[PDB]
Structure 1
Amino acid sequence: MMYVKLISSDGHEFIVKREHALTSGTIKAMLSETNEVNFREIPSHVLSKVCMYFTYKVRYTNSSTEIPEFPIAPEIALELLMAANFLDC
C-alpha cells in the first residue's frame, strides 16, 4: 500500500497508510506533491493519538456493529483538543 510520514514537534515519525490519512482534508491538502508532513506544534503523545483516530475512523465509519468509544486520557485532553481545533479533525 501507499504510506506517508507525519513528524511531530519532538521528532517522532509516524508512518501511516495514505488512504487512512486522506480521511482528513487537512492532511490531504498538506500533502499537495509530498509524502512527508511536519507538525512543529503537535507533540508525539498527541500525534500518535491522531493516527489512532485515523485508524478508528476508517474502521468504524458506517458500521451497524457496536462502535467502541474513542479513549482520551485526561493528561492529553487539552492538547489534543487544540491539535484537533487546528486540524479540523
Structure 2
Amino acid sequence: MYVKLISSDGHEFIVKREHALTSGTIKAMLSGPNEVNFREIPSHVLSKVCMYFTYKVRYTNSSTEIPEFPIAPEIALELLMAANFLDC
C-alpha cells in the first residue's frame, strides 16, 4: 500500500505505491523482476519529487483546469538531475 524513499541526508518519505510507480526507475528499483535508498538525492529535492507524484496522479487526464507546478530557482538544477534519473 505504501513505500519508503530515503534521501542522502536520512529523511524518510512514506508515499503510496501507485504514486511512486509514476517513476519508472523506482518501479524497477523495487518490484525488480518496501524501501529505496537514494544516496544522491537530498531532502530538499526528494520532497519536491514526492509532491510532483501527488500532482501528477491528481491532474493527468482531468477536465478541471490545471495549476502550474512551482519550482524555486535554487532547486531547479538538482531537481532536473533527480527528475532525469527517475524518468518522470
- Indicate the TM-score class for this superposition, using the shorter chain for normalisation: over 0.9
**Cα distance, 1:33 vs structure 2:** 6.4
Aligned length in residues: 88
Aligned-pair identity in percent equals 98
Q: Residues 35-88 of structure 1: CA distance to partner in whole angstroms, max 9, x if unpaired?
A: 100000000000000000000000001011100000000010010001111221
Stretches of structure 2 that go unaligned for 5 or more consecutive residues are: none
Q: Greater relative contact order: 1 or 2 (C-alpha under 8 angstroms, separation 6 or more)?
A: 2
In 2, the alpha carbon distance for the partners of 1:76 and 1:51 equals 14
**Which runs of structure 1 show a deviation greater than 4 angstroms over 4 or more consecutive aligned residues?**
none
**Cα distance, 1:32 vs structure 2:** 2.4
Residues 69, 38 of structure 1: alpha-carbon distance in 2 compared, 3 angstrom cutoff: same
RMSD: 1.5
**Which residue in the other structure is 2:58 paired with?**
59
